[PDB]
Design a protein around this nucleic acid. Structure first.
Length: 238
RNA sequence: GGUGGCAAUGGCUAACCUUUUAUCUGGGCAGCCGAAGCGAAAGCAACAUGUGCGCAGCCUUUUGGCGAGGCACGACGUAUACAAGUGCGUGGAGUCACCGGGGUACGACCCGAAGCCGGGUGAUCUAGGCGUGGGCAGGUUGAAGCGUGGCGAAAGCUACGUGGAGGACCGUAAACGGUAUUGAUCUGCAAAUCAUUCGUGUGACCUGCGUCUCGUAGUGAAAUGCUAAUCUAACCCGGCAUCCGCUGGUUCCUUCCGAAACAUGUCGCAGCAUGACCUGACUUGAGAUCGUCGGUGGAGUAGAGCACUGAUUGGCGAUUCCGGGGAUCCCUCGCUCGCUUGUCAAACUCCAAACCCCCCGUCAUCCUAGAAAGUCGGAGUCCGGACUGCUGGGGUAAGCUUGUAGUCCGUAAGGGAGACAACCCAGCCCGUGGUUAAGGUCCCCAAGUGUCGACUAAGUGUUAAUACUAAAGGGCGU
RNA sequence: UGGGGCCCCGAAAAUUGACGGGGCUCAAGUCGACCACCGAUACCACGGAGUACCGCAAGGUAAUCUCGUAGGAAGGCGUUGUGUUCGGGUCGAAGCAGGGCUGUGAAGUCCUGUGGACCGUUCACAAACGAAAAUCCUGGUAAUAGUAGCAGCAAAGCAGGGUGAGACUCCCUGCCGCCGAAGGGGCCAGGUUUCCUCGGCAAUGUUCGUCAGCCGAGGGUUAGUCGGUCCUAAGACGUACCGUAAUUCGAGUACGCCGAAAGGGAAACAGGUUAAUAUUCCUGUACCAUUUAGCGUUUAGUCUGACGUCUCAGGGCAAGCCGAGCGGCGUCGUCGCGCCGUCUAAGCAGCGAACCCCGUGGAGAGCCGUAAUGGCGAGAAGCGGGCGAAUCUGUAAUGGCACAAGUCGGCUUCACCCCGGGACCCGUGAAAAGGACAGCUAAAUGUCCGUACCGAGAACUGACACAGGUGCCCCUAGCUGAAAAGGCUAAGGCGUGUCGGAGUAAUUCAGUUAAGGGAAUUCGGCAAAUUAGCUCCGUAACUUCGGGAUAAGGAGUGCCUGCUGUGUAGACAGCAGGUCGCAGUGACCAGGGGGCUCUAACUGUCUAAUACCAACAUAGGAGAUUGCAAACCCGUAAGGGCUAGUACAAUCUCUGAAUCCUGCUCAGUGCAGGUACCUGAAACCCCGGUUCAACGGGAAGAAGGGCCUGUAAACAGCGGGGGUAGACCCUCUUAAGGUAGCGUAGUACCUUGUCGCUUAAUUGGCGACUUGCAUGAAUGGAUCAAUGAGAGCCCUACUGUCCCUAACUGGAGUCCGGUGAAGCUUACAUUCUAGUGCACAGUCUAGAGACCUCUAGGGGGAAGUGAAGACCCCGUGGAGCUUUACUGCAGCCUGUCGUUGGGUUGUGGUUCUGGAUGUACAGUGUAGGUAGGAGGCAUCGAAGCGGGUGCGCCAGCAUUCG
RNA sequence: UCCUUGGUGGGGGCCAAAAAUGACAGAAAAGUUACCCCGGGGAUAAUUGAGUCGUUGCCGGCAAGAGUACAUAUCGACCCGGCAGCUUGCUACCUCGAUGUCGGUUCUUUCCAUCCUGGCCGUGCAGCAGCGGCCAAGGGUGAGGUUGUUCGCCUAUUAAAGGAGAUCGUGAGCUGGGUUUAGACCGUCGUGAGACAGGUCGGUUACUAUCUACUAGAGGUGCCCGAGGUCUGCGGGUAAGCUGCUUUUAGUACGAGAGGAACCAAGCAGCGGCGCCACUGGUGUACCGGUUGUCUGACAAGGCAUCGCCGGGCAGCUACGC
């Protein structure tokens, strides 16, 4: 048994690959709201989120609950965030995406209604509302795909704060090391051709090279799905 | 196999009971083997001797007779299903023990690895993640930002001060690391340390304590590195007395005999089986052939030869042929075919030995104190080597390699060659005496300064064989 | 002239050697013959043993018997025990040492001594039954050998006097020394009595020992305040649920519970006392918590606990320093200096710097601040107030000090305390208990555990009294100096772990110096040497504009006298003059530099114990999957990692900073998409078979495959020969035929390729050329400032690297006292030459040498020792790894069945009503199915007609609207 | 013939034929290891050793001929016969319970097939100087650049800068550059792991001497009137030195000139050997002085810092001196 790969170690869940969950502030999700209800809260602080490297807003709601929310661009302390079917379509409010006009920018989008917010959550970029239909609403993702979601799916109006974070080059190994200290990801990473054959399919040889094509079938079992997984194509665009 | 019990109206019991404490006595017929074989099966189913030879033994006129056992036939059962031939079987000897040998399976004469697998142990070391602490002498450099001032029409350009950034610089025997000396040490202070010299030394930094991640798993800035002096799969115990054709060992005496290192098959080539060869016993009962001489047969090797197959050298004579050279093919002429010369052959033979082989007779030797033959028990052995021949084959040759006949060493003493596995005498129970073999006789060293006739002047030589001994050529040396 | 014998030339090898050696010449050589003798275990003779065969025996025969490995066969000896026969022994059994006799022998018996209670023997039977070997095992014990070691630690001791049987080694005094930012002080983990006292010295201590961490006996650890205990952290454990064939196994959830002697935290100090404990006992002076009783009560939910890195201001302070007085000690050749001390806890009371806040104020052709950033009509300066520190002041005062003084000032102040500012993000830097906000008084209570001592060059760990390692300190005094570097000294701890020694030779480990030369040494400047601090001047190519840089290259530097400037000060900077030495960073400390290349961008990581590299990583660049009930991955499952995440994200790969770039090839393999057609298992269905099935076919057809398309920053490839001043049309092209670059390379076999510089000379380096055996673009190409314990070459300086060694220093060695191992070993052994021999002999053969013993010395030989060769082969021995080797198994894709229900339609017949609708030719009439081969109905029904209700040839049967 | 009996469908068997195992007396079967492990083997390879000598080095016989003529001053074709074992092969006898692998360095020794030095002979030898051969192994045979090199090339001296053997002498002497481990790069192979008598960077050299041998120093015993002194010399060893330059002979012999010798004589030099220390140089941790930092209160006198450092230096030892 040529040793298990890094992916198999991560699946095992050893401490080297676990997230430092104690370092994080909150599990950011939309406040739970009953059917046909609303709640208003005020932003009391803008804090740094170590799990995202983006700002988060601390919000005190009317019901006595203090909650961390994914902060949108321009959200400020003292702002009144409303969450409900009747909420004003304004930056920071939590409204169903059926009430958002086409061409509007949303973020923290629920995959299903009441899900808490799944899509469009990293620092800076957004989703666009494209079309509206009776049971379906279409949004262009940051990927470029079109996602048809329930119009009752909730989302905060605006973009995620922290745009341009990756614009500054890392410039330095330790610069990225300090970011990797707060995440589960292993840093740094050894190239597979630098390993021995027992450690990777690409390892070994008198000279560094994979020895086999790097595009691997989608049917390959765990321990073999390495390189370019089910690649539609390869190379730089012609 | 040796010794026994019983014996075709066969042998023995197993479990078990009888124990009165494992014995023992008497029971115990279930079963097994024998008693009928052949055939896949269905199935069918044989000699209580028809004949001959003949050992022992007996009788006998010493040549014959009877002749158990034995041998050879004949006959019959069944399968081959048509037939014919043939196979197996058939005229009652087995069975159960004790003491032995041997095969097979089991740890299987004893020890000897790496490994494979099960369940457990380990992150006090080391690697990495996390929590919470500690640490980094003293200096250097001087980013942005800010103040003031210059040069400019502005655009803008620019000096100094302040400021204190950086996986920045120097540097501590703080800490961490480990370059070079390939220094010390190298049964050490130390199962890797010491001295000097070096790299990092505000950061991907070092480090305490705590905690987590581990065996086909972990960890790894990736070397197959590290995971408790153990890492290309840790350690403990278990499978396990693993297995091996491979290595090592295997313990008292005498006596009798005494090999094979070879063939065929083998995933066989360091092994094994079968056979040859050794050994023991029994059966049988009259011949056998290691040697000689003569004869009937086989020769196709040596040698010889050119008569076949092919080579091969000139001379001579012809092919008015097939062909090389400068219009009547105007004439020059190599091969081809013969008579003579000169040479040849593993795979040529008109010839043709000596050895040798089969058979017959003969002598010779052995043999009823058991020929030849048969049956059974036990093996070892299939690494060989050498000398003398075969111009053995191959090779430039080889103390090379591979054959063959004999004999040796192996397993062979003693005597002699300086010593010498296998070269000479000789095969050798113990003691004594004598005479010899090989070889030697100037001394070492037992016996010749032996005899005769010559040669050698070179210390040549003083060397049977042997791989341990120098050639071609020349010499008015003798 | 030919044929012959012997000899000569031809004829050269390596330690001194071989006719066996001496030697030998009408021979002691050769040739032809001969004579006598010597000389085996052969042969003969005698005697004896065994063997084979025969014989009833007695005995007979053997020229035709007597070697022997593997191996077969026969008979015996011995050990221990069993049955059985017969015995021996305290008047001395077994065993043991030595000896006699017998037997071929295995062995038996006896004698002497020793020993003190058991032992044999006949015939048989058994076995845990016989040893010289296994790098055999266990135990004991040699040679080595009185040898190595008791030497870097680190200057290590000496004198005098004691103690004692005994003294280098134990005690005291003095002198001389070591460490002195650790070798001192405190303490974690760990140790576990090593701590203290007394008495010892058999062992331990690397010597001795009276000493001791050793031996024996006794003693020693005192807590409301110091820790644990309490809280929670990463993260464990328990119960429940669920899984699992099951569990002591398993993830998650819920509830609990633990998890820090360095995180948080209620509170105590000074002095004394013992031989050893002391914030613990005693004295004095305090403080905290609950509980009880009384006196009063919420402000309630906030704050605190509670936080990173770097940098800086202000204030304070332990330590430190200076001057005066006082009290001791030292010195005193002269002087009057030097050293020590000159003390004082918590608690209690008092003040309060900065920040912040409150009231006034009104500030701009701008004002106020800071070290710095800054602040301001959204309200500056100024003026009042509140809140609020370290520390300081008093008290605690009649404690300890020689009841000796004990009183004052000043400076500085880290590395400690308080407070405030700024910068960075890239880790945004914990939680909970507890505390505060309403408590005051008085009594009682405050349990349990630890507490000695070491904390390391002797108390831990590494087997050790081990030169390593082990938490470290938020521990460390004076001078020099930037300094905690180095040197010299305090305090404190030590002389603690073998001595002596006469030149103490040679040699060796580590150092000092070295004429002239200066890398000629060597693979190579390895090693050593040079330089070195600070100040000032000055600083190149190149460059990514940051740097290179301390580049390079120059000058100064000590002491004394008198001063100047900055600053509140500490101090710092500078000046003038005088002056000594070979030398002024005088010791200590402390870069050598430059030029040309390769390579990697850089800092970093690594083979703990041979590889610190160009390898790994890195930032940067590119590609791929995935919209989250995702991609990818773990688990048998329950359920998980990534994930308290969401494309700017995670995961999977390649390349490897910047700069200029990254060309052509999709034939092969891979990947993705498409599936028109072909192939494609099972189930269902159909046919046949089967009294039923098995079975044989058919249909349909998923995934997959064939097949088509795309894709090279996927794996990869980018080629042969000949006509033309080696270009160009063709080729060979079974996809294409090397673009930019680079090139004898870290790739170039030929090869020491050719030329130029570098040298006297260069298989070298660099540059150019390049016919590239076999360069080339993210299998990344070229190039590159800076960086580098990387790899080469050159220049300079330097030198014992060398020419070529010498002297000296300390430690070993040598000699002496004490202590005291280990490793090679079948035996013998004073060897040397040659030959022989398994062809590499101290032992064989023939010679030559050699009197023995001891000491020192370097290593020729003992094919020296260490070690079942790691190179090679073999073994139907292993292990890992690879793959289009064989065979499988997981994972994944897909069909079918179950889970799995209800509706709507589209597809096959399931099942049957209204007609028997049936008709080449003509029909009066439709075969009214094949039919009693003929025979029943009817105005209470039999037809010529409408689109003719079944049907059809606008006919005609059934009587229906007529 | 098919399990109680009979039958059906379907099986099993007997004899024969066909289908193949070519590794053909019949397994269904690809690699790699330098990350390797284990058991053995000198039954079998790298290396030294033994044999052989094709090959290599050095020769010989006959002399074909060349040499203005003339085989033999010089060269030596064709063929033939050898020696050595120093090149490379062949072989597998010894060693796989290890005989440490190349090259260099240090030190010793041997061979002659002689490079120089000594003595000779021939010459197509006038002299100078060559060419060829014979004897001769006493001495010498060096210094440097590249390369790990052996070998080879090159440089300047030199009388010449010969070759070879000693386990390709010499790792219980040294070195570690090369080759021969584990890491890594480049190129080429291979799909790959990996490989390359291709290149490149890096990469642990253990031991206290038992015996023997040698170098030196002692104690004995033997020999011997007891002791002492002085000698002899059986023997052993030696390189009881080797070799250049210059002057002279002599600008002579010789030669037409150019050029240009020899005997004898002298001095000097290189290397070697032996000894010595007046001179000169080094060292000189005896000693003397200067001075930095610090301590002993200052001065003086002292300690320490490598002898603190720096300067000088007698004796002694030494060579770079004699």
């Amino acid at each position: 048994m040529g040793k298990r790969l890094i992916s198999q170690n991560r699946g095992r869940g050893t401490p080297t690959y676990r997230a430092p969950s104690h370092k994080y502030k909150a599990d950011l999700r939309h406040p739970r709201v009953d059917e046909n209800s609303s709640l208003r809260g005020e932003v009391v602080g803008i804090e740094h989120d170590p799990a995202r490297s983006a700002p988060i807003a601390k919000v005190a709601f009317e019901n006595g609950e203090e909650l961390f929310l994914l902060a949108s661009e321009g959200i400020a302390v003292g702002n009144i965030i409303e969450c409900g079917d009747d909420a004003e379509v304004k930056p920071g409010n939590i409204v169903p995406i059926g009430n958002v006009p086409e061409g509007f920018f949303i973020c923290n989008v629920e995959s299903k209604p009441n899900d808490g917010g799944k899509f469009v959550r990293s620092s800076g970029v957004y989703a666009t509302v494209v079309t509206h239909e009776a049971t379906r609403t279409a949004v262009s993702m940051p990927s470029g795909n079109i996602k048809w979601l329930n119009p009752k799916c909730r989302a905060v109006v605006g973009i995620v704060a922290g745009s341009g974070r990756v614009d500054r080059p890392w410039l330095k190994a330790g610069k990225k090391y300090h970011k990797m200290k707060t995440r589960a990801a292993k840093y740094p990473r050894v190239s597979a051709v630098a390993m021995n054959p027992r450690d990777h399919p690409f390892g070994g040889g008198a000279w560094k090279h994979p020895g086999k094509p790097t595009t691997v079938s989608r049917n390959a079992p765990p321990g073999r799905k390495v390189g370019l997984i089910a690649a539609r194509r390869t190379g730089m665009k012609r």
